[PDB]
């Protein structure tokens, strides 16, 4: 087969770019390993910064999110004493965030893609990339025994962390940087029970807790836990009792529990490859970098790069030129780092590491006091939470 851009990866990155390109007139084919269920059972993110919203806007998840997603103007951060509110809008120069839900923005892209007639080879095992640095790359997947060959012009890796694009890049051509943090996150998606209205972030000595939403009668909760320590060991009841355990007056008559919408899980780290490019391969999303879940970045990360991948593709196709397309990893790496940074700070002011000496934790307490206190303090939080500015081009 022949298409322009061949996408390995039907997660949201893969879909947006596909679902961006299509609208412009640059035929793409999504190449996905799994079934349209398994990707849809994947319950992750809830927070999308604007720009990834405007992006969705500049395509399609207008209808349903304009319709169904809580737009939020603040967060709260509690830290042994009390709850402290941020007011993102008046701190951020006037921006905010929407809690739509990852698995939803994903079902809409599979929705809208389905009706355009744009190609998507699901259950495609053995994907392989051939001819990267070449003038005509080609991708190869098995749909039987039936080894097929798709010649494209450009291959965009939206494979995710455990993808095959990244590895298919001559290692000496790459530069990794990564921190595997010592604790995972235990999620608990429950729906019957109503939430506590804004996001509550928490620095309790038993570890970190996080009350979140998906709907107005749908909750998303997490509590920091050590590694590989089994979930088969957690419980609804054992969850409800520990979450409760790390909160204030938000936690009792106020909180309502229930059995978990059979969603419960794990893990976190920071990782980044440099460069995000090879010949005609382009990594996007989790293929390229990994940021701790704590600053609601990652999907928001993948949107901002899927953005450059696409505008850079317009000019290639539509204008004449695009070696500008070499300047991609350049634009994207700027933002990935201020974002990686924002992510670790959050990670480390809120989390409880096995180590601290009364200085490190003395330091840890004081920085919260300072940032949650100073207006200059607070605006550094706000500014990064909603999203730093986006990007250059030309």
Ligand X SMILES: Cc1cc2nc3c(=O)[nH]c(=O)nc-3n(C[C@H](O)[C@H](O)[C@H](O)COP(=O)(O)OP(=O)(O)OC[C@H]3O[C@@H](n4cnc5c(N)ncnc54)[C@H](O)[C@@H]3O)c2cc1C
End-to-end CA distance of the chain: 32
How far apart CA 240 and CA 358 sit, in angstroms, is 30
Out of 201, 328, 371, 390, which one is annotated catalytic?
201
> Which does residue 374 touch among ligand X, its own copies, none (CB within 5 to 8 A, set by kind)?
its own copies
What contacts 296, CB < 8 A, 6 or more positions away?
A: 45, 46, 47, 49, 97, 385
Active site residue 170: no
Pairing of strands 147-151, 138-142: antiparallel
Q: What backbone torsions phi and psi does residue 37 show, to the nearest 5 degrees?
A: -95, -65
DSSP 8-state secondary structure symbol assigned to residue 20: H
Q: Please, what is the minimum distance in Å from the beta carbon of residue 175 to its own copies?
A: 7
Strands (E), 101-137: 120-121, 125-130
For residue 9, give the 3-state DSSP assignment: coil
Tokens of 366: 């004081």
Tokens of 77: 């951060």
Active site residue 22: no
Q: Which stretch binds its own copies (CB under 8 A): 9-17, 58-66, 186-194, 372-380?
A: 372-380
Out of 12, 297, 310, 390, which one is annotated catalytic?
297
Q: Which is nearer to ligand X, 46 or 322 (CB)?
A: 46
159 binds ligand X (CB under 6 A): yes
For residue 34, give the 3-state DSSP assignment: coil
How far apart CA 86 and CA 49 sit, in angstroms, is 16
Rule CB under 8 A: choose which of 177, 226, 229, 238 binds its own copies.
177
> Which does residue 127 touch among its own copies, ligand X, none (CB within 5 to 8 A, set by kind)?
ligand X
Active site residue 385: yes
Region of 23 (left: φ > 0; alpha: ψ -120 to 50; beta: rest) is alpha
Distances (CA, A) of 284 to 46, 114, 235, 272: 20, 22, 36, 12
94 binds its own copies (CB under 8 A): no
> Is 102 part of any known ligand binding site?
yes
> Is 44 part of any known ligand binding site?
yes
Active site residue 310: no
Active site residue 328: no
> Is 13 part of any known ligand binding site?
yes
What binding mask, one character per residue, do residues 350-369 give for its own copies by CB under 8 A, x or -? -------xxx--xx--xx-x
The binding site for substrate comprises 201, 212-214, 222, 293
Q: Name the site residues for ligand X (rule: CB under 6 A).
A: 8-13, 31-34, 39, 44-48, 102, 127, 158-160, 162-164, 185, 187, 285-286, 293, 296-302
Binding-site residue set: 13, 32, 42-47, 102, 201, 212-214, 222, 286, 293, 299-300
Residue list for the binding site for FAD: 13, 32, 42-47, 102, 286, 299-300
Q: Which residues are catalytic?
A: 72, 201, 293, 297, 385
């Amino acid at each position: 087969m022949k298409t322009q851009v061949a996408i390995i990866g039907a997660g949201p990155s893969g879909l947006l770019l596909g679902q961006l390109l299509h609208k412009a007139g640059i035929d793409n084919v999504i190449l996905e390993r799994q079934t349209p269920d398994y990707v849809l059972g994947r319950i992750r993110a809830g927070v999308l910064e604007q720009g990834m919203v405007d992006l969705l806007r500049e395509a399609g998840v207008d209808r349903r999110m304009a319709r169904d997603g809580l737009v939020h103007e603040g967060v709260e951060i509690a830290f042994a004493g009390q709850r402290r509110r941020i007011d993102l809008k008046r701190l951020s120069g006037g921006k905010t965030v929407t809690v739509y839900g990852q698995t939803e923005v994903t079902r809409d892209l599979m929705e809208a893609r389905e009706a355009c007639g744009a190609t998507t080879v699901y259950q495609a095992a053995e994907v392989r990339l051939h001819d990267l640095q070449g003038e005509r790359p080609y991708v190869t997947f098995e749909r039987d025994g039936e080894r097929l060959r798709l010649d494209c012009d450009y291959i965009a890796g939206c494979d995710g962390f455990h993808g095959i694009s990244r590895q298919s890049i001559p290692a000496e051509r790459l530069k990794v940087f990564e921190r595997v943090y010592p604790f995972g996150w235990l999620g608990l998606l429950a729906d019957t029970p109503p939430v506590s209205h804004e996001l509550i972030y928490a620095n309790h000595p038993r570890g970190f807790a996080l009350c979140s939403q998906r709907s107005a009668t749908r909750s998303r909760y997490y509590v920091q836990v050590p590694l590989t320590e089994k979930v088969e060991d957690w419980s609804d009841e054992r969850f409800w009792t520990e979450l409760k355990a790390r909160l204030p007056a938000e936690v009792a008559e106020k909180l309502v529990t229930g059995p978990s919408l059979e969603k419960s899980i794990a893990p976190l780290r920071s990782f980044v490859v440099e460069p995000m490019q090879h010949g005609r391969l382009f990594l996007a999303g989790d293929a390229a970098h990994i940021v701790p879940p704590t600053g609601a970045k990652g999907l928001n990360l993948a949107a901002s790069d899927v953005s450059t991948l696409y505008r850079l593709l317009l000019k290639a196709y539509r204008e004449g030129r695009g070696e500008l397309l070499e300047r991609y990893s350049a634009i994207c790496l700027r933002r990935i780092w201020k974002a990686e940074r924002f992510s670790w700070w959050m990670t480390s002011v809120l989390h409880r590491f096995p180590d601290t000496d009364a200085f490190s934790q003395r330091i840890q307490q004081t920085e919260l006091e300072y940032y949650l206190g100073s207006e200059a303090g607070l605006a550094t939080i706000a500014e990064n939470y909603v999203g730093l500015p986006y990007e250059e081009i030309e």
